[PDB]
Design a binder for this molecule. Structure first.
Ligand SMILES: [K+]
Ligand SMILES: [K+]
Ligand SMILES: [Mg+2]
Ligand SMILES: [Mg+2]
Ligand SMILES: [Mg+2]
Ligand SMILES: [Mg+2]
Ligand SMILES: [Mg+2]
Ligand SMILES: [Mg+2]
Ligand SMILES: [Mg+2]
Ligand SMILES: [Mg+2]
Ligand SMILES: [Mg+2]
Ligand SMILES: [Mg+2]
Ligand SMILES: [Mg+2]
Ligand SMILES: [Mg+2]
Ligand SMILES: [Mg+2]
Ligand SMILES: [Mg+2]
Ligand SMILES: [Mg+2]
Ligand SMILES: [Mg+2]
Ligand SMILES: [Mg+2]
Ligand SMILES: [Mg+2]
Ligand SMILES: [Mg+2]
Ligand SMILES: [Mg+2]
Ligand SMILES: [Mg+2]
Ligand SMILES: [Mg+2]
Ligand SMILES: [Mg+2]
Ligand SMILES: [Mg+2]
Ligand SMILES: [Mg+2]
Ligand SMILES: [Mg+2]
Ligand SMILES: [Mg+2]
Ligand SMILES: [Mg+2]
Ligand SMILES: [Mg+2]
Ligand SMILES: [Mg+2]
Ligand SMILES: [Mg+2]
Ligand SMILES: [Mg+2]
Lengths: 74, 134, 89, 81
RNA sequence: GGAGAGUUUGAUCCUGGCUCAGGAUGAACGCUGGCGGCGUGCCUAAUACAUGCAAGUCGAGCGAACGGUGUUAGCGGCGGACGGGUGAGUAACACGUGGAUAACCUACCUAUAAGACUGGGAUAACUUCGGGAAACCGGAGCUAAUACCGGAUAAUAUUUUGAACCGCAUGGUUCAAAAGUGAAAGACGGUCUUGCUGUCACUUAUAGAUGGAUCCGCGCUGCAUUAGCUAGUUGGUAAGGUAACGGCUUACCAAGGCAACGAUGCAUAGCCGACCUGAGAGGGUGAUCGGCCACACUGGAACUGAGACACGGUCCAGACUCCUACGGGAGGCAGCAGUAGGGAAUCUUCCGCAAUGGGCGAAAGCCUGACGGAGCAACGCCGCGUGAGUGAGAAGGUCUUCGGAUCGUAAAACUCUGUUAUUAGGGAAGAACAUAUGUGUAAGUAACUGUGCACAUCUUGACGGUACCUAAUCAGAAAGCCACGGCUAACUACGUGCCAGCAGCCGCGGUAAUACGUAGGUGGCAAGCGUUAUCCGGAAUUAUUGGGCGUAAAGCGCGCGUAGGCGGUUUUUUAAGUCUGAUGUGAAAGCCCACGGCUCAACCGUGGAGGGUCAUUGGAAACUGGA
């Protein structure tokens, strides 16, 4: 078929997906994070859990991801 | 500084400033606002011709007071020996400050608009707006 | 519709043509789908036709239509005969 | 306005708009009537639904509505039927 | 593939700024000006626009009228959403790059299949009676269609029953198997049998192709002397809505959402390929060509349509302009020219559809300010001229230590040439076709006509009698600009006397000025040469490459401490960084290399290379990160 983007992150409100942005001029890696509002269905996950998410069609004004699996419990 | 300091606060180069600021501005009459255009010359009208004394040097250096087409007042030097300028003359003004004359940052173009060429000039005539003799 | 047509290159009084597959609405020298050859009508001896025969039949079988001059070019290279023979067979 | 074919297009647009308005109005009336008849289980709720389905399909053929909108309207009646 | 120099001192070494030598331009200005080729030419007022042209076409869909087979207005179809312009708005999924849609739409085109049955009623035109200055509007009748509308047949489309199999959650692909429901058109030909049949056209279904839409990762300017922002806001449920998912909209429920990783606000800006500069790392720009977006006097809408919320369409509101007979009417150059205005500054109210491309048409063809050409401008680049050979120190100018020196083999004189120029003679390519006419073949036919394919004949050039070529005649028409103290190539005389003037810097001029002005000579360039403006370089002068902080500018007065940055030794493990292959993609044009055509060169063309912090995927495990 085709593959949808997958991320792993920590719940910050019941997902933060911290990544690195290498500096264009100096070459140093700098940590940056982006919050991915995701769809949890039956409110299963809680704050601090490390979760896996997958990209979906728009679900609301800002939700574009579905929580597929919980990796590390809060 | 450290690499981390440079990442937090990158280098910043000094901003260059223009030696002829009155040439790099336009004026929209309809909107009564100033533009930024970088012209090489500007038309203007002579408000007050006259002379001024230099700063070691000693002379009576001829100049004119000009209101440029962008409604800015400048002091412009009149090069060459003799000129035909007076009040209400229409002149073309170019860049180039004259040392020893404080507050005169521009030159009047000889042989353009109402300014005549220098009379009797035979060497470097194109700098003084003089046609080729004979 | 989709056309097989000539886009102009070269310089003044010295035309050179690329043979392209393009949307009819695209500007003559603008966006194309795929180039399939060249055409030089001012060459010294031969008009220097350089058609990619496998590409031309794929687009002809996909509904692309040549302009009048491109039809003559494809005919001079036998592409029109192979197109008609493959359609019946 | 200025161009001869633009002037003619004003007339043909007005003629099409008048026909389209009538057919849209009739189609919407039958859909609303069929919707009400379901919410009360009338004896002829089947005839009113069949009429509404007939007109919605004719509007889609006339490009008055998209086929996707006709399908969405058709289902809403038929599930409730 | 990387150059420095001047300037702070009596002199020095540092530090440090300043200035200069280079390249470039949509340039402008001054002086000057021969030609050819190729390109480029409103950067300012998205200011206002006189006039002409920039979108039509189809009589083989239809009736009528006027003319003698033609044509006009009208109905109808298709086009007018392309092509062309502009960069105002926009800091945003607008754009670049990489993906996703199991949340999408798609006229014309192509292929396949099944069809194309049976009825009806309008109305423009038109005739007639009016009303209005006009724009135009009313009354009465009349009439056609591939216009419009009923009915029949057609399901893969919808509902329900389920089932099998599969995916990434919603789900998706089939298998059914019942119920509703949805079409269409003829024109011109052949054969004739009024039946069959060719082409184009029509309907439905399914694919392909094309075009469009939405979403997401990363990338995107300043200002913190801008720190709080949001209340459909953030999520949920339901309904409505859309091609489609969705606060897209509404109702109710909850109080979320964003932000120091810079929210928000203000300002600025269309973005990219590219372009200029630089050794590179970088810095600067978006005119021209190409891609994407946005806009069309300002603001708000919707209609038709496959597609528009539509530059040369409609409706409404506003500013402005124009006609009026005062009731009323009309308009939108950021299309091509052109005008006025603004400005330092940017062109013809040209020719043609011959070529390429586009719309309509069966075709002939018509339309096409796209486009192809011509005109103007040294605005740029490239090429060629303005003569060549021989010619011992003539005159004239300038200087002179009045011997001479120098302009100078320069001139004249003798011969020679004709690129150019003038006159005349010839004169390409760019043209491929289409149509028509013959034959042949393929499919189909009962057969033919026709259709596809092939060969042969026919017509067609705006530029333009242009390029080019040939002959004759004549050195005759065709050189200017800046500079010469040092940087920096090239010096003397006279005039002037801190005046007049020069000047990028150092500075020059106050009576013996190589710096002012002129003259002779010389230097540098040359149809150009200088000046100004602007950008990069020199500038290691924001220093990642590549700088500093005792006294030159620079260590917070000093603790405690949050975020962040960084972090000792070893083993196992992982695979985010790192390394190494594969695949896809990074358009075309451009730059660079190679080759080909232009007499050369510019330029043009062809084939490569390059350019990602790109994605996906297979390996490695030392280092950084995770366990
Ligand atoms: K000194
Ligand atoms: K044409
Ligand atoms: Mg030929
Ligand atoms: Mg030219
Ligand atoms: Mg402009
Ligand atoms: Mg205007
Ligand atoms: Mg007609
Ligand atoms: Mg069709
Ligand atoms: Mg019809
Ligand atoms: Mg702007
Ligand atoms: Mg450098
Ligand atoms: Mg519609
Ligand atoms: Mg339009
Ligand atoms: Mg217009
Ligand atoms: Mg115009
Ligand atoms: Mg003016
Ligand atoms: Mg054509
Ligand atoms: Mg016309
Ligand atoms: Mg000039
Ligand atoms: Mg020297
Ligand atoms: Mg001088
Ligand atoms: Mg003297
Ligand atoms: Mg000097
Ligand atoms: Mg001098
Ligand atoms: Mg030259
Ligand atoms: Mg610089
Ligand atoms: Mg510099
Ligand atoms: Mg330093
Ligand atoms: Mg220190
Ligand atoms: Mg001190
Ligand atoms: Mg100090
Ligand atoms: Mg201290
Ligand atoms: Mg202190
Ligand atoms: Mg060349």
């Amino acid at each position: 078929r085709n593959d949808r983007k997958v991320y792993v992150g920590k719940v910050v409100s019941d997902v933060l997906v911290e990544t690195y942005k290498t500096h264009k001029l100096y070459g140093k890696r700098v940590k940056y994070s982006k919050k991915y509002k995701t769809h949890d269905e039956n409110n299963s996950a809680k704050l601090g859990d490390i979760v896996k998410i997958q990209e979906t069609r728009p679900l609301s004004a800002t939700k574009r991801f579905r929580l597929v699996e919980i990796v590390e419990e809060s | 500084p450290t690499i981390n300091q440079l990442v937090r606060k990158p280098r910043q180069s000094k901003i260059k400033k223009s030696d002829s600021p009155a040439l790099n501005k336009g004026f929209n009459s309809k909107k009564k606002k100033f533009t930024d255009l970088n012209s090489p010359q500007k038309r203007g009208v002579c408000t007050r011709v006259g002379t001024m004394t230099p700063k070691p040097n000693s002379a009576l250096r001829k100049y004119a007071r000009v209101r440029l087409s962008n409604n800015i007042e400048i002091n412009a030097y009149i090069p060459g020996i003799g000129h035909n300028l007076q009040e209400h003359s229409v002149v073309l003004v170019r860049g180039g400050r004259v040392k020893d004359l404080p507050g005169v940052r521009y030159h009047i173009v000889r042989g353009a608009l109402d300014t005549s060429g220098v009379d009797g000039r035979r060497q470097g005539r194109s700098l003084y707006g003089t046609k080729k003799p004979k | 519709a989709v056309k097989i047509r000539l886009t102009r290159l070269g310089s003044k009084r010295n035309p050179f043509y690329r043979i392209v597959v393009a949307d009819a609405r695209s500007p003559r020298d603008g966006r194309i789908i795929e180039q399939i050859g060249t055409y030089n009508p001012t060459s010294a001896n031969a008009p220097e036709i350089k058609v990619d025969e496998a590409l031309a039949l794929k687009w002809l079988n996909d509904g692309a239509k040549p302009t009048d001059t491109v039809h003559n070019i494809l005919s001079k290279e036998g592409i029109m005969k192979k197109f008609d023979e493959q359609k019946k067979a | 306005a200025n161009i001869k074919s633009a002037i003619k297009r004003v007339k043909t647009t007005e003629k099409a708009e008048a026909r389209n308005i009538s057919q849209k109005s009739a189609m919407r009336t039958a859909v609303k009537n069929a919707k009400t008849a379901v919410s009360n289980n009338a004896d002829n709720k089947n005839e009113l639904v069949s009429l509404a389905v007939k007109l919605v399909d004719k509007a889609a053929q006339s490009n008055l509505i998209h086929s996707n909108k006709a399908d969405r309207i058709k289902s809403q009646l038929m599930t409730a039927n």
